[PDB]
C-alpha cells in the first residue's frame, strides 16, 4: 500500500588522521497516496544500507494531509531553512507542476494536481521539509468550520 521513493543520495565525508572517511546519505519519502506523507534521511557507509535506514525513518514519523479530490485545499506557503516553497491547488488534469524533491513528496502524498514553486534554496532535504510543513499546515473547510464555530455551508 505504501509507495516509497528515494529523492537524493549524496556522498559526504569526515576527515581523519588517515585520510577521508566517506559515507552516504539517502533522502527518501514515502506515502500512501491519500493523506499520509513521511520523509526520511538515512546515513550509512554504503548506499543501500543508508537508503534502507532512510526508508525505515520515513515509515515512522509520517503525517496526515487534508486533500480535496487529489489536490490541495488552498494556496499554501511553506518554509524551512533557506527553502521557501509555494503551492497552489490546480484543476484536474493539470498534473503535478513541481520542481525537484518537491515533485516526489507530492506524488507519494497523493496530490495529483498542483502548481508549485520553490523559492529560496532548493536544497533537497530542506525543500522536502518545507513542502511537508506546508502540507501539514494546510487546513480543510470542515476544520475551519469547526474552529470558527460555523457550518461548512456558511463559510463556502
Amino acid at each position: 500500500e505504501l509507495q516509497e521513493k528515494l529523492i537524493a543520495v549524496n556522498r559526504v565525508s569526515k576527515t581523519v588522521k588517515g585520510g577521508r572517511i566517506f559515507s552516504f546519505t539517502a533522502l527518501t519519502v514515502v506515502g500512501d497516496g491519500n493523506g499520509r506523507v513521511g520523509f526520511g534521511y538515512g546515513k550509512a557507509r554504503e548506499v543501500p544500507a543508508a537508503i534502507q535506514k532512510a526508508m525505515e525513518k520515513a515509515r515512522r514519523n509520517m503525517i496526515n494531509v487534508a486533500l480535496n479530490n487529489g489536490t490541495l485545499q488552498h494556496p499554501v506557503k511553506g518554509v524551512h531553512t533557506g527553502s521557501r516553497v509555494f503551492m497552489q491547488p490546480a484543476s484536474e488534469g493539470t498534473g503535478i507542476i513541481a520542481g525537484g524533491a518537491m515533485r516526489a513528496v507530492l506524488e507519494v502524498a497523493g496530490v495529483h494536481n498542483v502548481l508549485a514553486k520553490a523559492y529560496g534554496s532548493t536544497n533537497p532535504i530542506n525543500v522536502v521539509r518545507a513542502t511537508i510543513d506546508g502540507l501539514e499546515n494546510m487546513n480543510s473547510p470542515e476544520m475551519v468550520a469547526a474552529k470558527r464555530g460555523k457550518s461548512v455551508e456558511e463559510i463556502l
Binding site: 485545499q73 488552498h74 494556496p75 475551519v144 469547526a146 474552529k147 470558527r148 463559510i155 463556502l156
Partner: protein, 129 residues
C-alpha cells in the same frame, strides 16, 4: 508616532494569539469597533467589549480551538503608507474562500463575501485566515 491604529490592533490580536492570552485590550475607535464586530460575526473571536467614556477601551476575547489559536493569520492590506482599494470584481479571496477579507465599503465595514453580495468594492483593511 502611532501612525496606524487598525494595524496596531491587529498586531495586538496576533500577539495575544501567540501568547495564549484570554483577552486583548486597546484604545477604542469606531473603525476598530466595527472591525471587531465583523470578526465576531465571522467567528474569529468570542466577544468584544467597549468600556469607558472619556477614553474608552476595546476588550476583545480571543478564541482558541483544540489548544491552538483560531486567528491563524491576520494581515493588514491597506496601510497609511500605501492604500489599497478594490472594485467588486477585484475583491480578494483569502485562503481560497475559507479566510475572510475585511473591507470598508460605502455601506460600512464588512467581509469580502458580504461586499461581493452587495455589489460593491472598497478599501481592503485586512485579511484574516
Amino acid at each position: 508616532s502611532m501612525q496606524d491604529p487598525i494595524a496596531d490592533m491587529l498586531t495586538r490580536i496576533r500577539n495575544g494569539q501567540a501568547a495564549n492570552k484570554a483577552a486583548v485590550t486597546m484604545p477604542s475607535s469606531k473603525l476598530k469597533v466595527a472591525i471587531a464586530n465583523v470578526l465576531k460575526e465571522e467567528g474569529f473571536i468570542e466577544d468584544f467589549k467597549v468600556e469607558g467614556d472619556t477614553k474608552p477601551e476595546l476588550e476583545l476575547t480571543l478564541k482558541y480551538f483544540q489548544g491552538k489559536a483560531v486567528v491563524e493569520s491576520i494581515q493588514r492590506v491597506s496601510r497609511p503608507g500605501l492604500r489599497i482599494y478594490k472594485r467588486k470584481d477585484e475583491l480578494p479571496k483569502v485562503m481560497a474562500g475559507l479566510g475572510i477579507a475585511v473591507v470598508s465599503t460605502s455601506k460600512g465595514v464588512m467581509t469580502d463575501r458580504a461586499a461581493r453580495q452587495a455589489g460593491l468594492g472598497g478599501e481592503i483593511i485586512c485579511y484574516v485566515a
